[PDB]
Each structure stands twice: as C-alpha cells, then as structure tokens.
Scaffold this motif. Sequence first.
Motif, PDB file in Angstrom:
ATOM      1  N   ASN A  50       0.815  -1.193   0.000  1.00  0.00           N
ATOM      2  CA  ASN A  50       0.000   0.000   0.000  1.00  0.00           C
ATOM      3  C   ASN A  50       0.852   1.248   0.000  1.00  0.00           C
ATOM      4  N   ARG A  51       0.264   2.333  -0.465  1.00  0.00           N
ATOM      5  CA  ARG A  51       1.017   3.552  -0.629  1.00  0.00           C
ATOM      6  C   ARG A  51       1.590   4.058   0.703  1.00  0.00           C
ATOM      7  N   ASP A  52       0.795   4.007   1.756  1.00  0.00           N
ATOM      8  CA  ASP A  52       1.238   4.551   3.033  1.00  0.00           C
ATOM      9  C   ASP A  52       2.283   3.656   3.734  1.00  0.00           C
ATOM     10  N   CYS A  56       8.972   7.662   0.384  1.00  0.00           N
ATOM     11  CA  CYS A  56       9.344   8.271  -0.882  1.00  0.00           C
ATOM     12  C   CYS A  56      10.450   9.301  -0.724  1.00  0.00           C
ATOM     13  N   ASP A 135      -1.240   2.754  -6.729  1.00  0.00           N
ATOM     14  CA  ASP A 135      -1.671   4.035  -7.297  1.00  0.00           C
ATOM     15  C   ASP A 135      -1.204   5.225  -6.448  1.00  0.00           C
ATOM     16  N   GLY A 136      -0.748   6.278  -7.122  1.00  0.00           N
ATOM     17  CA  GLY A 136      -0.258   7.487  -6.440  1.00  0.00           C
ATOM     18  C   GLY A 136       1.231   7.450  -6.244  1.00  0.00           C
ATOM     19  N   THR A 137       1.856   6.325  -6.574  1.00  0.00           N
ATOM     20  CA  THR A 137       3.291   6.284  -6.641  1.00  0.00           C
ATOM     21  C   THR A 137       3.704   6.297  -8.112  1.00  0.00           C
ATOM     22  N   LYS A 160       8.571  15.410  -8.257  1.00  0.00           N
ATOM     23  CA  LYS A 160       7.328  15.421  -7.502  1.00  0.00           C
ATOM     24  C   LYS A 160       7.574  14.801  -6.136  1.00  0.00           C
ATOM     25  N   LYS A 162       6.298  12.984  -2.459  1.00  0.00           N
ATOM     26  CA  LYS A 162       5.405  11.922  -1.986  1.00  0.00           C
ATOM     27  C   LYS A 162       5.004  11.000  -3.126  1.00  0.00           C
ATOM     28  N   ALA A 163       5.934  10.709  -4.025  1.00  0.00           N
ATOM     29  CA  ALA A 163       5.585  10.033  -5.267  1.00  0.00           C
ATOM     30  C   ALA A 163       6.556   8.935  -5.699  1.00  0.00           C
TER      31      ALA A 163
END
Lengths: 257, 258, 259, 256, 258
Positions: A50-52, A56, A135-137, A160, A162-163
């Motif tokens: 997961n993203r969290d 990054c 998603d979002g990475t 960018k 947080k990516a």
Amino acid sequence: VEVLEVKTGVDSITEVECFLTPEMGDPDEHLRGFSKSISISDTFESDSPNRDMLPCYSVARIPLPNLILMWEAVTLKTEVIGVTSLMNVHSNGQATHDNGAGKPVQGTSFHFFSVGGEALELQGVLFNYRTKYPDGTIFPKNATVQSQVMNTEHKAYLDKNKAYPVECWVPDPTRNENTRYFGTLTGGENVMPVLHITNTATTVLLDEFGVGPLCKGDNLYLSAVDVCGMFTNRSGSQQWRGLSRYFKVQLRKRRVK
Amino acid sequence: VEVLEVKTGVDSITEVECFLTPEMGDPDEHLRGFSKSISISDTFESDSPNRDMLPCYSVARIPLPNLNILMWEAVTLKTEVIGVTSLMNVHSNGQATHDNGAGKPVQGTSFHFFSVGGEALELQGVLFNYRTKYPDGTIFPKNATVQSQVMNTEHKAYLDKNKAYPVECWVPDPTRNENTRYFGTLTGGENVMPVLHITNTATTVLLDEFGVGPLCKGDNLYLSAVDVCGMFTNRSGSQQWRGLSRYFKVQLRKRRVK
Amino acid sequence: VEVLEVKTGVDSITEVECFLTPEMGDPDEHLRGFSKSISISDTFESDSPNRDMLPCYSVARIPLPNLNILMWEAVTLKTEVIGVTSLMNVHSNGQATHDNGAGKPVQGTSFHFFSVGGEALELQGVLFNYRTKYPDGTIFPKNATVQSQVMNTEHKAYLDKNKAYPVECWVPDPTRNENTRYFGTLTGGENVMPVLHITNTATTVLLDEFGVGPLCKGDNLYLSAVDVCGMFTNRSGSQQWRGLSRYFKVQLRKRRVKN
Amino acid sequence: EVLEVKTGVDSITEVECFLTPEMGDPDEHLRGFSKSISISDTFESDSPNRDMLPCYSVARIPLPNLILMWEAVTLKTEVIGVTSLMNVHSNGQATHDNGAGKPVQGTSFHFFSVGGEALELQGVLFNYRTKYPDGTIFPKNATVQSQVMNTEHKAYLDKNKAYPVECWVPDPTRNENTRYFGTLTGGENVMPVLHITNTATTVLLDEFGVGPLCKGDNLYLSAVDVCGMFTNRSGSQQWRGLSRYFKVQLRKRRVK
Amino acid sequence: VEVLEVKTGVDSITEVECFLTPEMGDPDEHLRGFSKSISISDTFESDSPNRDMLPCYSVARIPLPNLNILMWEAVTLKTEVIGVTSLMNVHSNGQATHDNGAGKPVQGTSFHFFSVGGEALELQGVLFNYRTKYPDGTIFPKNATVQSQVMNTEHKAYLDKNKAYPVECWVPDPTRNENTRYFGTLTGGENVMPVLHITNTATTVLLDEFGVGPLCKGDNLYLSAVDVCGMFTNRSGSQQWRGLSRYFKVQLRKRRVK
C-alpha cells in the motif's frame, strides 16, 4: 555551455536555507513521519504494498534571485533535524526484554541528499519485478525480470513529492552531471543509528574543474531521504521512521556562453 | 557586526575551565547521575513521562573579565567526559549477563553533545510523538501538532535554564546558532556499546572559515552539554539512563568589533 | 618555569624501555593477570567488592640520569600490549559458545589506558555508586556523597602506588595533568570484541602545541597503564577480568629551564 | 617502454557502463538471486548446483580504433539499486512475530577491477573435494594443497557466468596491467553498508604515473557484488547481487 | 654496523615474491588449512592441547643473490591474504544458521600478522594459562611460572622453524626486532565478522625514520605470517580454525655498510 568567470562584488553571492520533511507514508492523522506498519506478502508474485507503507524521496525546488549569468552552488551544510527524538523509548514500544525500556528506532536505514541545478535523475531497480506498486506512486513501468538487476528503460526525474518510492529508485550514475549526490544504505535488523550533528561541517560542491551545479531557470533542486530505521510497537509490528533534513547552500554568480 | 583585529600582548588572552554535571532526572537522593527507571505507555495517546525519567540539557553561563568595543572570542576547546571508568562497576545490583555472570554494563542508546557560544544555544523542538504529555517543571514544545513530529517552526527556544529542557524534544536549531559551535552524536539501539575516549592532547578549533570564533555578548560564555552514556540495567531488568559530567577548557582572546 | 633551548650532542639523549604488568586482582597463586570472579550485590547499599575483584592502575616511577637547571623532556613513545595472541586460548576451562563448540574468548568491557609524565598521574574520583564500600588495601574516594556519582572535587589523588588505585573509582583529572600526556579508551558492553594491533613502526609524539613534552621533576619518569582486555568466562559461567602487560619505550632529551 | 601522453581534444575518451551480477538465476523470475542454498552431509559429498554459485562478471569494452594505446587513468564506480534492499515486505521471514521481513544481510563480497587485458585468477578451495558442476570453470586436478595454495590453478576471467566467486581470486603474482579492489565481509550478522556518490574518483595510475594499457584497444571491467543473502518465509536463503556502474577516463599514450 | 650509501644501477635492485602457507594443524590428509576441532579442558591444570589443534606461525627464509661490504636492504612490501572468497562456501557440512538456512561462514576470533626482516623474528612468550601442557613437536615457553601469564622475560625465542611455534603462546618481542618490521591485529569474539581487503595498489614502506629498511644478514630475507581467519563450524557444532596463505612481494636494494 562554456563556463567563464565568477562575478564578484557584494550582490554576487546568495544563500538558500531550508528544510525538507520526510515522506514516510503518513498512514493516519497522528503519524506524520512514520509509515504504515509493514506487512509481508505470501509470495513474490503477490507482493503489493500500500502507498502509506512506502517511504518516498523528498524534493524541493527553490527559486533564486532572478538573473548569460547563472547561480552556481558552491557549498552545502546539511543536518538531520530532531535526532534526539529517537531517545523516546517510553511510548508504545516493544520492550527489549522483561521490564526493559522500549526498543529504539533501529534496523535498515537510508540517508541521502543531493544538490543540483536541475531535477535529480533516477534509475529504477527492483528487488522483485512482480511487486505491484500502488496508485499514487511513480514506479518503473513495463518491469521485466531484468528490472531486478538493470533495465535501462527505467529513467525518471525526481520532480514530484510523496511520489517516487525509495525502494524502486536510485540516482542514475550515467546522468546527473549538474547534481552532486550522496547516500548511504545501512542494511540489517541489527543496524544501530549513528547520527552526527554539527554546524561546523561543510561540503564543497565544486567538481574537479572548480565548477559547481549551475541552476537552470534560476532554480535550485534539493533532494533527500532520511529513513532512520524502524520503530517497533508493543505488538511487534514495525514501521519506518524518518526525520527532516536541513540544507544551507551558498551560491555565486557565474558567467557562461 | 564588523570584526576587526585581534589584540596581542600577555593581557590579551584568558581561559575558562569548568565542568557541567549531567541532569538525568535524579529520582531520589541516592541516584544523582541516573534517571528514574523507564516505563512504556500502552499507546502514543497515553505517553506521559515523569520529570525524573527525562534527561535534560546542561548549561552554564560563565562571566568573563569585563571589557568595556572589545569582545572575548572563543578560539579553542578541550573537552572530555569525566568518570568513564565508573562504567566498569558491574557488581552493583546489575542483571547478570547469563547464569553466574557479571552484571551488564551501561550500554544502549546514547547522546553526547557539547557546544560553546557567545550567547545561549538556540533550540528547535522535534517530537517523536506529538501527543506526548511533557511534565510540569520541564520546558517543552507548546501547541504541538502532528507536524511537530517532523518540523514545526513554532518550536523555538533558548537553552537558558538547567533541569528544564528535555533532551528528547529539543535539538540545536541549525537555522540559527551563528554565534555558537555545536557538536553531537546520537548512537541508537539496544546493542550499542559505549566507546569513550579520553586524552589531554586533543583540541577543537572554534574559528569559522573566516577565522572568527564565537564572540561573547555582555562578556558571557555559554557552555552546553549532554552526555547520556547508555542505560543501566538493574537485577529486575528495569533500565535507567546513566550520565556523566563533561569538562570544558576554552581559550579566548580579545577582538575589536564595531 | 621558563623553557629554553634543547641540549644537543651524543649524550643529550636517553631512552627508557620497560613493561608494566597488569594488576587485575590476582585471586590465587595460579591466577596472575586475572581478577576474582565477579559477584553482584543485591542492592546499591550492599555493594562491597573484595580487593582481588578490583583491577587497579599500574604505575612505574623510573629514575633518570641525575642532571643537577636541566630537565629530561619526554619526546616520543612507542607502546604495545604484550601477549595479544594468548587470547586465542579457547580450550582452557572456558564456557562453550554452543553445544560442542570452542570456548568463549575473552571479550566484553575493556579499558585500555596509558600515560607518560614528568610527575605522578593526577586522579579525580568518580563513583558509579557512592554507597559502594571499597575494601582494605585500596585507596578510594573518601567522604563519598551522592555528588560523587557525577563530580565531587574533594576526590583528588596521585597515582603513586601499585596494586592500590581501583580503575572503577578513578580517572585522570582533566583539570590538572599539565605535565603528563594521557590516552584512554573505555569500550563497554557484553558484546564488545577486543581489537588489538601490534607493530614496531608506530610512534606517539609527546610534545604539546609549543613543542614541549613532559619535563621530569627530580629526574623521574612516570609511566602508567591499564589494559583490561575484557572478561574470561569459565565453564560455570562465572566471569573474571583478564589483563595484559604494556610495553613502553620513551625517548628523552635534555632541556634547559629557569626557576 | 612507455613514452609521452597525447594531448588535444581527440586524445581522450570515456567508457561508461553497467555490469550485471551473475548470482545463479534459478528460474525465469529470479534474475539477481541464487538458488536456495542447501548444505552437504559431509565434505566429500559437497556438490553444489550451478544456479547456487555466484560467479564473477566481466565485460570487454571495445575502444576507438587506434604505437598508441589507450591508458585507463580514472574510475568512478558504485553499486546500482542499493535502495531495493529496503523491500522487506516481499515473502521474507519476519524478524519476530508481526515484524517486518528480514533484509538482505550476511556474508558479502564486493569487487571491481579495471585492466587492459583479462583479470588473472588464482584458484583456492574451501574444500578440495567439492564437486563443481557442469557449466562452471573451476580449479582442475584439485588436491588437498588446493585448500591453501596450489599454483597449478591459474586462469583468465574471460567468460561470464562461468567462474564461481568461491573458487577464484585475483592472482597477486600477476595482474601487472590491471588494478583490482575487493572486500569480503563474512558472517551471519554482517550488515550491508553501501555508499553512493558521483563525487568520488579512484586514480588508476601506478607509482610511475602509468595506468592500465589496453591491448588490442579493449578495456576489461570485472566485478562481484554479492550483497548478502535473502531469507524467504521458510527460512531458506539465497544470495542477492546488484549491478555495478563503471565510468573510466582514458587517454592516448605512445609506447615502443 | 654503520650504514652508508645505497648502490644504484640496474643490478642494484632485486625482488622477492612468494606465498607462505598457513599451519593450522592439518589434522588429517584432507584437512590442510584447518585445525583439529577444538575441545575444552575441565580445569586450567588439565589444559593439554593436541598438536594438530594449535595454529603455528609460518616462516620462510629466502636466500638472496650472494653479495660478498654490501647488504640487501628491504624497502617496500606488497602483501595480501590469498583465497578470501573461499570463505563464501556455506554449503559444505556447515551448521545451519537456523532451520532451512545456509551454513554458518567462518567467523569468530582471528589473528592476522606479517613481518619482514633481515634475520629471524624474535619472540616473547606469554601464556593465557601457565599450566597449559604444550605437546611434543611444538616449541613453547619452558619453565613457565604464574608470572608467565603476564610477563616472564625468560621466554625468548627465534621464529626459526615451521609448524613449531604456536600462535597462542608467542608474540613479537617489542624489546628486540630492531632489524624487522612487524604488523599484527587480534580481533577476538565469538561474533567477530572477518573483513578481508584485497588490492594490488597498496604498498607498505619498510624504511625506518632514518630511511633504513631491514638489512639481510648472510643474504637471507625472513618472512613470517599468521592468518587465522576465524573458525569453521560443522554440522555437529564442533569448530576448527581455518587459515589462508599470504602473498609477499618485497623490493630490495644493495646498501653499503661498515
């Protein structure tokens, strides 16, 4: 660009000073600076963080006084901010043994910083090419098994926040002529953080010809990762902990043709 | 503001020599140099450390010979931790390493820090956990938010009082401290092994790159220190921070300023 | 004292060469270079170590050729721990690392220290636990108070006797020792691993920033050392300190002084 | 005889590339990993499979066609993808209950060389009775002396995926036209320390100011970067390696 | 010996290049480079190591071109441990780190040592345990007393024979060896992780502070080494020393002496 003389005089120098906050995942509203607890997939093929849970790279673009003259980055002072906070061993940590204090942040770390006159250039490398990045990475696309060692298709700019996940990307040594970068990965469960602070240490950014990063469009690019290790809570679950990084950069005006 | 020449002649120099005792919490009248045993909250929300469980920064303000413009400029420092050999007491209510073993020595997470300035060390607050309730009698970051876990520029302070500023929530502010030289190392982890060097042959030069040291405003020198050496583990397994005093020897010279 | 020129010529120089044996406690006639097994007190207030369980500072006062003003000036030191390979004996009554394994080697907390001076090393007392009762035959901080756990300026002494000053009570006093050069490393922790280098090609220079080394009052050179290498663990698990001797070679030259 | 250096803008050239690791590649998904390590019951029955044995990597890089020879003067180098070792969520064995996966750690070998011809090798065997498998090139006529020094075991690093790391080292009695650097860090508890920067340069010139001279206009680059072992959920372990970047500056040198 | 000028000319220099093999005990015909598995005595008194359990110092006496007056002078050394990668064999009857894991690599206590001189390395005996009973075929400190555990100046010897002088009871004598340069490091601990560097770009200069290297008496160069890399643990848990050969390349020049 041919590089000519440095301009002198009182207005021919300037200073940039700032801090870059870490981007560790921030899994809820109380946990800025931490990642989500880490989970382990059953198989390589089913790895889907997961993203969290993914730290990054941090990046800032700093505008410089408007100026062919270009600002040339000459020296850097830098420091991790808040090192002493890692002495909180009394807050929901797992004890080191019966009746002991809490375990400090420890284990695998990555401390990295760069200064450039344009975006840091990245090369993608994957531990496991079948990892499904969230998603979002921004991650290496069209991964193959060669992406586990070197796939030159995986090129990006750190453009960018947080990516760009730390685990997917490293500075591209084949590019980055207008950036100076420094990183250290210290890996292992038993890694013990050693964090020095001082306002007396300076890094010189000049290359062997005496030329520092030249700031295109009057923009200075600062980039950092300071994953200090993992915090272990009472249940044994672990999460990354990061700290902010200070930058002080001295620049001077350089003429180019 | 404008730094001019150094004064010469036998009368143009002076020395300051002293020691800063550690302030580790002092939980009772027999335990100076120790914190209270460390306990662990059930949640971040319930973290409320006792005053006597929190090591603090030490500071001394040292009056220098009156000058008036001239200012005293700090040029060199010799410093060392005092009493390193006391950590070879492994027979005093320690937990044995194994059956019939000697007591565990002080070890684990440590912070060693010293600074010399012509004014108070300037501080920036950073919190491990912004919901930590800091106790009465300490000075701590106020109006803490979740952003205080990484960087909240509201949290500025001066190291201007003893037994007040907890180590864990304050660091030297790198955005300020022009008139101070500071040096610190955090060595973190349960298995950290203290490596403590002593010698009277080492000197740190305090001059900046333009050859100018800290300039002592109002003829005051500010010395600051933290020497958390590790934790001592007693027979039950509970742990408390152990600190040691720090020696400072500073040479200063007169400098003309405008 | 005003320091003037160095004397030159054939016999302007002299050399001192010797070894300082460790004084670890020597609990019986077979255990020179070891302490007694460590036992742990039940409380801070009941800590009363026996003498043979306490390593002490070693010191030698070496008389130099009578000069009288001239003084001998200590210029360079060569030094080395003697017998480092003895610690590879892992077959002698030690506790096995695991089932069928070799013996644990000496390891854990160490203090390596040496000094060269023109007078006795000056000591400051600092106590882990001020309520510790130090034994007869040792010279320890007197009138201990709780402040002795951090800094009590009453505890001043001279390292002027062997088998006497326990390592754990005393350190070189950084407020004094102008006429001594000292060097020490405490490496603490159960998992500390000894790292001992030997070579005859290394020299330490003893001159201060003005080019002046230790000046030997009354023509005596003071050498001091501690080399607690770690702990030996026997088959029962009990642990005792193990130390080794230290070699010293000091070059000295004649220096003229006034007053 | 080595004579003067040529100058002028045509007198220098630059080689830049990556060497991929050759760790064993046990299946089509596992490039950069070895096969799981298994242990023989005795010394005599040690016979590892090919895909369990990391090998030396080598690249021979052709240079602009040129007596003049290209002289290797400076090198920049680093391990590529160091951050990938922060993947502790992919089928790893947990450190303790509910903990993250163990990272790559343990025994490591990091090695690189630059030469004007193939790296010369000397064979040394942990166990002379080890049966090395087909498709590797290994010390032949191994004797018990091969466990300490048997000077019959000489070879050139002239093929990829062939020379196992554990069998071979640079021959210090040779390699006059190569500069090599290696570090073995051994032990279950070894923790990787991997530095990256584009600001660090190694000079390749010897004590007489002469660098490696490239015979037949070829530059030889060699590497091993065994970073440690990955432990999967069952506890079985495999070597993990990473690629190595090389940038070499070269100049034209006259010789007779 | 008054030392005069260095000869020059093509013929005035020579080179010695060779390998010294380790002498770890070689307990059987398949186990060259290994010691016998280590066993532990139940008392200091009963310590009786077998010969093949005791690593010994290696030495080579290398004769040089005959000169006569002139002596060969040792000026520089390249040296390195040969076979460092063999320690990556973790698949050969080793004890697993854990269930299903690879075999433990060689690790633990190590001693790495080399010397170059113009005569035999001079040794001083020091004993862990003076009552250790050293075996026939070894050359060990005689008339040991309890003072031999720290320093007994009776224990003097020359490293003048191979697989004879056990590592554990002898060190270079720092009161002698004027005509030898020596370098050693003991790294001790069950948890010691070997760190072995190789490169052909490093040189050690053997000249003293007066510019004079070792002078080879009777045209003989003496090389000595110990490279105990750690212990190999087999499946049963029993452990034995493992060693590796050492490369030496020495450059020498002719020096006139009176």
